Amino acid sequence: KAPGQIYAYDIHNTHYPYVNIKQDSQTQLLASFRRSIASINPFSYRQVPSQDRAAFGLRWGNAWYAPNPYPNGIHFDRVFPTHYDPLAETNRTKANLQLIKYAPGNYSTLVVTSEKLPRPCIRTIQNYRRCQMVNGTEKCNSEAQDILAICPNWALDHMKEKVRFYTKALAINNQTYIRAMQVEEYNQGRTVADVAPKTWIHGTRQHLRPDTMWADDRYTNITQTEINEAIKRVEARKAREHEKKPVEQANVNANTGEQPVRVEKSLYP
Amino acid sequence: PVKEGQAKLWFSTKEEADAYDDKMISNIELKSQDYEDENFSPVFNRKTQEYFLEPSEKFKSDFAELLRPLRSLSFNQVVDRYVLIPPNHTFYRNWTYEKFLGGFGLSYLILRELPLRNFYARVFVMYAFAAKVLDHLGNPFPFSGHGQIVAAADRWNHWDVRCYDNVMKALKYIRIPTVQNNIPE
Amino acid sequence: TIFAETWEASEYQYRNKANLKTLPVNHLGKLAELKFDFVEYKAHQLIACHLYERMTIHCMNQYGLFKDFYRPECLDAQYYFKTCVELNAAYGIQKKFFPEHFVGSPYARPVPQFQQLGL
Amino acid sequence: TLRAGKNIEGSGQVHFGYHDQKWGMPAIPMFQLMYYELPGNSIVVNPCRNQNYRLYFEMRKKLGI
Amino acid sequence: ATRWYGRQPGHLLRADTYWIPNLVSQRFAKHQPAHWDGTQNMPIFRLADPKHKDSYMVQFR
Amino acid sequence: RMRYLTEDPAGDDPLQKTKDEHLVDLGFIPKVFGANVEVRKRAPHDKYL
Amino acid sequence: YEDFVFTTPYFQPESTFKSVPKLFSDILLGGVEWVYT
């Protein structure tokens, strides 16, 4: 009847790893001394949980440790606009009552959740499906009416909206299919027979050279003389391409009192 | 001249390949460290080898050290060892917090008997001891707030209230208010 | 998937819901908290969540994963990287299947056709 | 209520608008005889929960315990 | 509709002695004739909006 | 012009508008239209601001 | 499909290539109210 141990106990082989995140000499020296005597120390606390004993988190000096919350620009002013910038400081300054209140969920992520339909509403749905697969759709009118009657109206609104969502998601997945299965102009008439016998590693740095001049030693023996001759050749090829240039188009955002188009920004200001 | 290597280009013809080298070479700017050179740069000398971020040997050896107790075991032994821990809900798990936080009170019993002669010297000691406690307690006034203790996350957190749904919603979910500002129906 | 280094902050804010989170750009200030020497190119710092990934690799190469990686500059890099790829995965799905939730979408508040105005 | 998804403007329960208020029990014996505050310790789990233990007694006899 | 009509900014006088920069600066300002352009909304003063560049020091509460 | 083009989100309450389920039972089956995604809001002349 | 009927209208694959130009729209958390004192 020994208590169960978690996998982390087999990584550290002890329940008393004196882990302190504060990287000062006084803290780490005391942590090393306390780590050695933890077997016979009455003032010892566990940081590795077990089935029989709970544990503490990571220590920060005398207080406790928690990472800096992910940067969130949402805040609420009290006295004056602070123009809070989460990227201007390393550690988030504490919220004073007269200065700011930060957004909720210092440690929180975005997920999708769903309410659970009432148990009686679920039992009527199961009875309709079972009667449907056994007797057919046309002989389930009694079970279909029990759903509309027993299931509360908020459940019927959720059931109606789930169908509209999955109908929306179905079209979005198929539009991605049509774009994915579209035959491009560079792949016209090409089939699986024209594919090169290569794998993912054949497109890496060892086999396919990157588009940088110092990725390997290819251009390490180039002198100034060869550079000057190469400039004469690239300018000679431009004696045939500079003949074409797109015409200046109209500025669609010329009117300032008009909602501008979110056009692609210039690479440089 | 151009040196060949294991990493090859991606062009079908040789004219396309030679055109790519000419474009890359015409952009090379030599920066030499020796005087009497047409391309001399004491400062702002460029390197000719590109750096690549790769997982080092210490990187891959420590990630393999986390899985040491799993290699000697089969999958059935792994599940029976770390997943299928026999249920035993009779232990006093919170004794860890009781001994730690209760030690503040026991420490005060011994600390209140210090043979310090000066009364105001013990005023300083108790102020330092209250500083140690207030890092966990937070608010010194009663009926005002709660203490803050960061605890380890294990499978036995909230083990006896997993059955209740409203406890899960209150702890986990921060719902986003809509324009129709109401609690979900 | 964002196919650029930069994104409009307003395009990831909700129009019909309270805005409690943003999708901020990489926190370049955390890169200066690493005490050791490392090589980082400015061409990799703007793409989403990748700077925190490279910081984690640099920290796990200098230190290991035991008693040396456990310092405030290295744990925040790993926490930011894990949190960043989680938020971006959620925002990416929400952008794909709920585009009408965000500011700038033509379906957040649809403009009617002229045939519906009865003129 | 805020975490449940309802944003709150203002504060308190003295509703300025078209809502009912409840001021709190006047501390005089007249109202203290008619009313008393809700004791949370009186809201209990239904005792029918204890009938699930019938499953344990039947299982123990089947297994020959 | 009511909120939209309320955002169309009202006209707020530029003359101000409550802010010490305007109390000094406006002693050197030259009042120029504002020729009527045929409208009834010539913003010849500042606008009664908290975000206006000449009204940000005013507390709209 | 900016305040003219400054709108609030969500518009008005859709529940205070004519339902499509009610029109069907009244004898008029409404036709569903698509969103006009090509129009750009602009400010009028200054005389109307 | 796999012993399941999901009734949907006839899908139009041409809706995939619908030219929807993105328009500018900025949200200002912190703006103007209706009335002020």
Partner: peptide, 23 residues
């Protein structure tokens, strides 16, 4: 939703000044 929330269709630039918030 925040009571001071507006949607603007034309670009604006905010001041980076302490204690003040304006266009």
């Amino acid at each position: 939703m925040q009571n001071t929330t507006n949607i603007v269709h034309v670009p604006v630039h905010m001041g980076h000044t302490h204690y003040f918030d304006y266009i």
